Amino acid sequence: ATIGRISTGSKSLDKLLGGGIETQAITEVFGEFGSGKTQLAHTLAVMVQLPPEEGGLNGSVMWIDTENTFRPERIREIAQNRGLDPDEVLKHIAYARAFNSNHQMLLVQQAEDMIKELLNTDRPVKLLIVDSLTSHFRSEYIGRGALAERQQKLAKHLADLHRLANLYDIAVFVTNQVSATLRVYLRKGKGGKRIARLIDAPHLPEGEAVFSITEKGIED
Numbered sequence: 154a155t156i157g158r159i160s161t162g163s164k165s166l167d168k169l170l171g172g173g174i175e176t177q178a179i180t181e182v183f184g185e186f187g188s189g190k191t192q193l194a195h196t197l198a199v200m201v202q203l204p205p206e207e208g209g210l211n212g213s214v215m216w217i218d219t220e221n222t223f224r225p226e227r228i229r230e231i232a233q234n235r236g237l238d239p240d241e242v243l244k245h246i247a248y249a250r251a252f253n254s255n256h257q258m259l260l261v262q263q264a265e266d267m268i269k270e271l272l273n274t275d276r277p278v279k280l281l282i283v284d285s286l287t288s289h290f291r292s293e294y295i296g297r298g299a300l301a302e303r304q305q306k307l308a309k310h311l312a313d314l315h316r317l318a319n320l321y322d323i324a325v326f327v328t329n330q331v332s333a334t335l336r337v338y339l340r341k342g343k344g345g346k347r348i349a350r351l352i353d354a355p356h357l358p359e360g361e362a363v364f365s366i367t368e369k370g371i372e373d
């Protein structure tokens with residue numbers, strides 16, 4: 154299938170990304186606390202439900218939350234401020250809490266079932282979020298005796314995510330803190346604006362996009 158793109162809500166950021174985040178890809182967004190990465194996640198979970206003409210893929214969402222950062226009320230706000238029905242938008246985000254790194258890996262594996270179920274329906278899964286990719290791995294695998302296993306488990310986890318993205322035409326979006334992924338680094342700009350910098354993309358120029366966080370989520 155042709156690569157689809159989901160608008161981030163920001164024209165500036167979309168331009169930097171070549172149109173939006175891609176299906177058949179893992180977009181990995183880095184940032185310190187308050188960077189906007191989770192706000193971007195919340196915005197994408199609404200945007201993807203729109204028709205292509207409005208920046209979406211008429212899709213549903215699966216959301217794996219490792220540190221209790223998903224806010225249903227924020228989804229409702231973004232949905233309503235963008236003219237959608239907040240209750241409908243929430244119903245199409247399948248939520249899972251991951252309690253530890255093993256569980257997180259299992260949740261990605263088990264996600265394939267729902268993906269298959271929805272595949273040839275009116276609302277196929279088009280966005281799979283892991284927020285965040287590494288919090289559990291960082292907590293559980295301490296020091297150098299644990300590095301080898303941490304990297305191997307993380308590598309397998311990313312491989313599983315890649316397979317789902319490619320096989321089922323899904324945009325995978327993961328957050329992190331400092332191929333195989335498209336890496337975007339968020340930082341604070343001036344006057345409460347945020348800045349995204351794209352780094353090491355094989356076929357997109359490096360660059361920056363300035364964006365705002367509003368009642369609509371992310372926008373210029």
Ligand SMILES: COC(=O)c1cccc2[nH]ccc12
Binds near residue numbers: 261263
């Ligand atoms: C209701 O949401 C789920 O069941 C779910 C969401 C994200 C990943 C998942 N993996 C298995 C179930 C599941």
